[PDB]
């Protein structure tokens with residue numbers, strides 16, 4: 001197995017996947033690495049299994065259909081994995097914890113949002129459709145862009161949104177378009 005966490009790229013107290021060489025801190029994996037379970041298989045492996053059991057699941061889909069899906073176990077897992085892919089980027093730090101807004105010439109968002117809030121919401125089964133998870137993820141970056149206006153820091157929102165959107169299209173097999 002790898003000697004660094006797949007998500008944050010640091011060493012420490014690492015749990016190793018039994019079916020692949022990846023490793024994780026407990027609370028870096030989503031869901032948090034499970035207490036017992038031998039063997040244990042990481043989210044990467046669990047997602048690959050879904051794909052292998054239903055190869056047709058990789059055929060192109062419309063985003064509107066994907067958003068309306070209920071959060072049954074496979075869609076719950078897919079959202080967990082998508083959230084984890086965002087945390088894999090180091091720039092996710094800016095969006096992880098609860099923000100605050102005191103900048104001359106800007107007013108904070110009406111509905112603040114952050115990654116650890118989406119993480120808690122997934123863990124508490126608060127989303128009934130994929131749309132609820134995707135709307136809160138997009139709101140993170142939209143709030144950022146609106147608040148920072150012309151400051152070049154706005155770019156961090158565009159960057160992390162792009163990581164979200166590419167991973168969304170991959171994980172939910174969104175039909176490719178020009």
Ligand SMILES: [Zn+2]
Pocket residue numbers: 005006007008009010024025028
């Ligand atoms: Zn980690």
Ligand SMILES: [Zn+2]
Pocket residue numbers: 017018019020021022041042043044045
């Ligand atoms: Zn694995």
Ligand SMILES: [Zn+2]
Pocket residue numbers: 053054055
């Ligand atoms: Zn099948």
